[PDB]
Structures are given as C-alpha cells and as structure tokens.
Amino acid sequence: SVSEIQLMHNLGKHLNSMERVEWLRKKLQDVHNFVAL
C-alpha cells in the first residue's frame, strides 16, 4: 500500500483500537519471554 512508513505506518496485523488493547494483553505475556507458544 502507499504511505506505509508513518513509523512503518505503525502496522501490526492491521492493528486497530480494539486490536492494540488486545495486542498489549499479548505483549504482557511476551515482554518477559518473546515466544509464540
């Protein structure tokens, strides 16, 4: 897409408002491990 670099157009699986709040819930069990398991 065009203009996809606004902070890398702060993209993350099309992170929206309800996706960023759930994102943060996943980043809570990630910031001290960084593993998808």
UniProtKB/Swiss-Prot annotation:
Residues 20-37 are annotated as: Important for receptor binding. GO terms for cellular component: extracellular region; extracellular space. GO terms for molecular function: hormone activity; parathyroid hormone receptor binding; peptide hormone receptor binding; receptor ligand activity; type 1 parathyroid hormone receptor binding. Coiled coil: none annotated. One of its GO terms (biological process) is response to lead ion. It is found in: Secreted. It comes from the Eukaryota. Changing residue 24 to A: Strongly reduced affinity for PTH1R. Keywords: Cleavage on pair of basic residues, Disease variant, Hormone, Secreted, Signal. It is linked to Hypoparathyroidism, familial isolated, 1: A form of hypoparathyroidism, a disorder characterized by hypocalcemia and hyperphosphatemia due to a deficiency of parathyroid hormone. Clinical features include seizures, tetany and cramps. FIH1 inheritance can be autosomal dominant or recessive. Parathyroid hormone elevates calcium level by dissolving the salts in bone and preventing their renal excretion. Acts by binding to its receptor, PTH1R, activating G protein-coupled receptor signaling. Stimulates [1-14C]-2-deoxy-D-glucose (2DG) transport and glycogen synthesis in osteoblastic cells. Interacts with PTH1R (via N-terminal extracellular domain). Belongs to the parathyroid hormone family. This is Parathyroid hormone. It comes from Homo sapiens. The gene is PTH. The chain holds residues 32 to 68 of 115 of the full protein.
